[PDB]
Design a protein around this ligand. Sequence first.
Ligand SMILES: Nc1ncnc2c1ncn2[C@@H]1O[C@H](COP(=O)(O)O)[C@@H](O)[C@H]1O
Ligand SMILES: [Mg+2]
Ligand SMILES: [Mg+2]
Ligand SMILES: [Mg+2]
Length: 303
Amino acid sequence: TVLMRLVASAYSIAQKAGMIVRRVIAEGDLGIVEKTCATDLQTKADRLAQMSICSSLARKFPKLTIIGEEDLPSEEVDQELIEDSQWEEILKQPCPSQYSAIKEEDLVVWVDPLDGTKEYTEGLLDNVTVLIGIAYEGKAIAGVINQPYYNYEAGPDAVLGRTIWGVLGLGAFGFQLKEVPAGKHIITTTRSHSNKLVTDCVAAMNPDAVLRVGGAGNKIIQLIEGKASAYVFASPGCKKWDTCAPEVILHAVGGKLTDIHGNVLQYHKDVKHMNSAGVLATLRNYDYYASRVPESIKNALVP
Ligand SMILES: Nc1ncnc2c1ncn2[C@@H]1O[C@H](COP(=O)(O)O)[C@@H](O)[C@H]1O
Ligand SMILES: [Mg+2]
Ligand SMILES: [Mg+2]
Ligand SMILES: [Mg+2]
């Protein structure tokens, strides 16, 4: 099927993006550009990874809609950046029948070529993900997440980097699902984009621990691996490419991702990019957290 060949291609493409991300650091010049402010950055890895991802997808799927974070002038793309492979192991998995007839022109791909760029520049390398989300009829249905510096500090016997993928109806793959210890409320949130509304919303959850880490992809991986019980970000700032692939993986293991009002996010081609009402995500016990978002904070954000 189109969908599963897409997913298999996105897996190999994400890995190539992860290689580019690691090569940029290995070579030592990040080419940092400030966009709106000093915490809103774009590096040579953001730009090269996006060129790689988008070019490689468009070559294979010429009528697909592809939407990437970075606003890059249209240039020659370096042909070494093209990834032609697709991981045959994913094509061994049966496409769910509900998706088996989808045409490429009806799919929307939401790409964050490097998520956690501020942290990447600061050396918090394992916060970084590459996000490729696939949506149909406004719903996020499949996703690939590369974590190019997974195991960066695990020592010399460990595999560096990993790729996680999922398709709703088949589940999600590439990690060990774990829950936080019972009765413990561990809230994860932004490290670099905090404000009073964000920290007040965190405080309202009566946290046992608050983690401050970069990346939307990274924080969803914290939920699925039992490092945090809730991701709580009561602020605009993140966009559909930050949430599309991560929500697929979270949904695939029974979790929930919504705005702070409890609305599901939408992923149609023409949807506004901003997640203007923030993000609330959990693996389990969603209602504990949702029921504690203060009304003042809800009223401070809209769609
Ligand atoms: N105020 C902001 N400005 C720019 N990007 C943001 C902002 N808030 C969140 N993001 C993005 O949303 C994702 C998750 O945010 P964080 O938890 O701060 O890493 C990352 O891409 C951030 O760069
Ligand atoms: Mg950004
Ligand atoms: Mg990014
Ligand atoms: Mg991002």
